[PDB]
């Protein structure tokens, strides 16, 4: 403080003062209610409010938003992946169709036609012209006895061996090689005591064991 | 009024005009040109320096992480329904395993055991009630060789109508209801040496058309 300039004392000391001997009030808490002065009405223009602004709280988070999309997208991925076109031509009868053709159904029809000609060979008279008429004139035979009965009978057997090839390459079947037994005695009683066809007929079902057992046989698969 | 005599020089005016700029070109390098710094002498302190900082580092990069979580997690959710291993799913004839037990394979064996009893009934002694009526055989043997009757043959047909119910319970595609014709003439030629027995045998394959035609809901038509 300079006396030559007459500096003036600011009001900073009155604010920093700690003691106080000027207040002459009998009470500042009980009298505050007498005038109806409560903090409730002051809390409206004095109490703080609620301020909260977040960008992730309102805006959608692309991070978690991706996990919510794959939820149904992935669940439907393998679901629709199982269905490609919407049709099953195999019908559980020719799975080889996917890697072949599936003649099992079609060829099944041509077989019913030729399978009958075997016994109907006598009902169908030969009317087509033959080219062996001049070859018989050289031998000239007069004794032409009838001898047709076992030739077409045994023919029904080889007719199945030649068909085992087109079917052998069908695909991979593992039905039942152990069941081949229950099917054996099944034909034994079907035969009679006199002529037993099961003796030579067994060789026909036995060959089926190879085509079916084909499920696993690298020993003869080169 | 004449300050051109050489009065004192006031400094208040020196502050008004105290700006200068020897360099007027746009390039400010002319200021350092006065030093003549060389690149070689400066390359000596060219050790550490020349670098940058990543901006995405401060930002989180786990956004796509939430998408990869449900990516494979949900992809397997539906896969568990079908099965990852898949042991004997169809095997070519096990499609009923999902809507049945698969008696077509096993039950097929019990049929070979009873299907033979039909003809074997003559090879073994019957157990019909009434041993007195057989007094003719107990008194003496008279003609007891092989003999196929028709009263026992018709029983082979009544056994196929009672077994179709256990199989019809499953129901399957008609496969080829149009092929039923190509199979008819195939049996007509199978016999041609007198009275064709296929005449009555047709009723047997005819019932098969109903089991296979089952492919469509019977209520849709009736």
């Amino acid at each position: 403080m300079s006396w030559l300039f007459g500096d003036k004392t600011p009001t900073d000391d009155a604010n920093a003062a700690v003691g106080g001997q000027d207040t002459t009030k009998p009470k500042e808490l009980s009298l505050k209610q007498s005038l109806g002065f409560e903090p409730n009405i002051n809390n409206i223009i004095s109490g703080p409010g609620g301020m909260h602004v977040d960008t992730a709280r309102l805006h959608p988070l692309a991070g978690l938003d991706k996990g919510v999309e794959y939820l149904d997208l992935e669940e439907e991925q393998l679901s629709s992946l199982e269905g490609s076109q919407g049709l099953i031509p195999s019908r559980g009868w020719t799975d080889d169709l996917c890697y072949g053709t599936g003649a099992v159904y079609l060829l099944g029809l041509g077989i019913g036609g030729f399978s009958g000609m075997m016994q109907g060979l006598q009902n169908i008279p030969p009317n087509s012209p033959g080219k062996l008429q001049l070859n018989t004139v050289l031998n000239h035979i007069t004794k032409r006895g009838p001898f047709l009965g076992n030739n077409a009978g045994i023919l029904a057997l080889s007719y199945n061996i030649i068909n085992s090839t087109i079917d052998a390459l069908r695909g991979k079947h593992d039905t039942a090689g152990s069941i081949g037994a229950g099917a054996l005695t099944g034909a034994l009683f079907k035969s009679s005591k006199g002529l037993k066809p099961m003796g030579y007929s067994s060789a026909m079902v036995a060959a089926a064991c190879a085509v079916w057992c084909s499920v696993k046989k690298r020993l003869l698969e080169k | 009024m004449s300050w051109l005599f050489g009065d004192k020089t006031p400094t208040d005016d020196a502050n008004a005009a105290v700006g200068g700029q020897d360099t007027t070109k746009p390039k400010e390098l002319s200021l350092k040109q006065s030093l003549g710094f060389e690149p070689n002498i400066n390359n000596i302190i060219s050790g550490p320096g020349g670098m940058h900082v990543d901006t995405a580092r401060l930002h989180p990069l786990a956004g796509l992480d939430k998408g990869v979580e449900y990516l494979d997690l949900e992809e397997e959710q539906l896969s568990s329904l079908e099965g990852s291993q898949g042991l004997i799913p169809s095997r070519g004839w096990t499609d009923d395993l999902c809507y049945g037990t698969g008696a077509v394979y096993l039950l097929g064996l019990g049929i070979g055991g009873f299907s033979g009893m039909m003809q074997g009934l003559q090879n073994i002694p019957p157990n019909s009630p009434g041993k007195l009526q057989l007094n003719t055989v107990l008194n003496h043997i008279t003609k007891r060789g092989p003999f196929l009757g028709n009263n026992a043959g018709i029983l082979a047909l009544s056994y196929n109508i009672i077994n179709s119910t256990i199989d019809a319970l499953r129901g399957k595609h008609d496969t080829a209801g149009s092929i039923g014709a190509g199979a008819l003439t195939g049996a007509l030629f199978k016999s041609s040496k007198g009275l064709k027995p296929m005449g009555y045998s047709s009723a047997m394959v005819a019932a098969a058309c109903a089991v296979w035609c089952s492919v469509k809901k019977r209520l849709l038509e009736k």
């Binding site: 996990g67 991925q77 679901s79 992946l81 199982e82 | 494979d72 999902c98």
Partner: peptide, 25 residues
């Protein structure tokens, strides 16, 4: 064969993409 779904929600297939795991929700 047993392979027939029921009712499909539009079409949105997707080839195999990514193959790792970190968090779980």
């Amino acid at each position: 064969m047993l392979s027939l779904r029921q009712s499909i929600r539009f079409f949105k297939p997707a080839t195999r993409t990514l193959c790792s795991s970190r968090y779980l929700l």
